[PDB]
Design an enzyme around this catalytic site. Structure first.
Site, short mmCIF file in Angstrom:
data_model
loop_
_atom_site.label_atom_id
_atom_site.label_comp_id
_atom_site.label_asym_id
_atom_site.label_seq_id
_atom_site.Cartn_x
_atom_site.Cartn_y
_atom_site.Cartn_z
N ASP A 1 6.94 1.02 46.05
CA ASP A 1 7.68 -0.26 46.11
C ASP A 1 9.01 -0.10 46.86
O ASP A 1 9.39 1.02 47.22
CB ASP A 1 7.77 -0.93 44.72
CG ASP A 1 8.82 -0.30 43.80
OD1 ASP A 1 9.32 0.81 44.03
OD2 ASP A 1 9.15 -0.98 42.82
O1 LIG Z 1 10.39 1.16 50.92
C1 LIG Z 1 10.43 2.16 50.17
C2 LIG Z 1 11.62 2.85 49.98
C3 LIG Z 1 11.63 3.95 49.12
N1 LIG Z 1 10.50 4.33 48.49
C4 LIG Z 1 9.37 3.64 48.71
O2 LIG Z 1 8.33 3.98 48.11
N2 LIG Z 1 9.34 2.58 49.55
#
Ligand SMILES: O=c1cc[nH]c(=O)[nH]1
EC number: 3.2.2.27
Lengths: 218, 50
Positions: A68
């Site tokens: 995410d």
């Molecule tokens: O967009 C991102 C930023 C950090 N870590 C993630 O998994 N995704």
């Protein structure tokens, strides 16, 4: 570049032609959840949730997938830090430095590398809280990742815990490598050889390896 | 999936793929056992047992 209309912010979703087959289902799914998710302030902002749908897919050999967005300051481009300040992207850049021997650089972005689509499994989090919107994105996340994996040769997921069950989320088998998140204990991400592994797997599929040094910003 | 060890096995699988001219039982069994490991480890790989 086409667009479709939804009933909640951001109201319009612009998309490259290669995404067309999922867009009507995306609209239905987003409309049923968006009001709940919009009760929180988010990373990224709602107007940036879907900006990666402007990328083509048909020229993509690899998907680099995080769980995410940055808890804060997400741009809608996974891992992207405009002023090169987030730990995760700096760590990714140090690994590529070590791999390629490029020692002087001012930044790194996965989204300017030929053949790579950086992706986030979940498209938002409540500001400051990782995985807080997992429950909202679930069906959308499957829909979009499944579509990506029809095009790419290799899916690279970052986070051993986060992606321990990723195969269950996909229909058709795809080459799948799960490595460490950049913040893993004991410098485990430093020792991880995922970028090199991806290239060998691409060669095994008679594809062109990724030129990881294209990510550098000078 | 991660490791230097994994990378070494894949590189060896690639080298054997590029030859495909197995002169003994060892090499052909190695090649096929590497395919099995690669397929199990990464779900799907681009080469097939022979
Ligand atoms: O967009 C991102 C930023 C950090 N870590 C993630 O998994 N995704």
């Amino acid at each position: 570049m086409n667009s479709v209309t939804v009933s909640h912010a951001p109201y319009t979703i612009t998309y490259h032609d290669d995404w067309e087959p999922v867009m009507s289902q995306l609209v239905e799914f987003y409309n049923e959840v968006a009001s709940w998710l919009l009760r929180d302030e988010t990373s990224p902002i709602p107007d940036k949730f879907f900006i990666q749908l402007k990328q083509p897919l048909r020229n993509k050999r690899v998907c680099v997938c995080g769980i995410d967005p940055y808890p804060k300051d997400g741009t809608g481009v996974p891992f992207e830090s405009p002023n090169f300040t987030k730990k995760s992207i700096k760590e990714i850049a140090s690994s590529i430095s070590r791999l390629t021997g490029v020692i002087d650089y001012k930044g790194y972005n996965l989204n300017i590398i030929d053949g790579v689509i950086p992706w986030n499994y979940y498209l938002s989090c409540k500001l400051g809280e990782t995985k807080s919107h997992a429950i909202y994105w679930d069906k959308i996340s499957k829909l979009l990742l499944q579509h990506i994996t029809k095009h790419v040769s290799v899916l690279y997921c970052l986070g051993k815990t986060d992606f321990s069950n990723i195969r269950a989320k996909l229909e058709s088998p795809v080459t799948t490598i799960v490595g460490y998140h950049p913040a893993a204990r004991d410098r485990q991400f430093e020792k991880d050889r995922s970028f090199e592994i991806i290239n060998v797997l691409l060669e095994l599929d008679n594809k062109v390896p990724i030129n990881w040094a294209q990510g550098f910003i000078y | 999936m991660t490791s230097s060890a994994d990378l070494t096995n894949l590189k060896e699988l690639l080298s054997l793929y590029k030859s495909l001219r197995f002169s003994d039982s060892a090499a052909i069994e190695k090649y096929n056992s590497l395919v099995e490991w690669g397929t199990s480890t990464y779900w799907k790989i681009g080469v097939q047992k022979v």
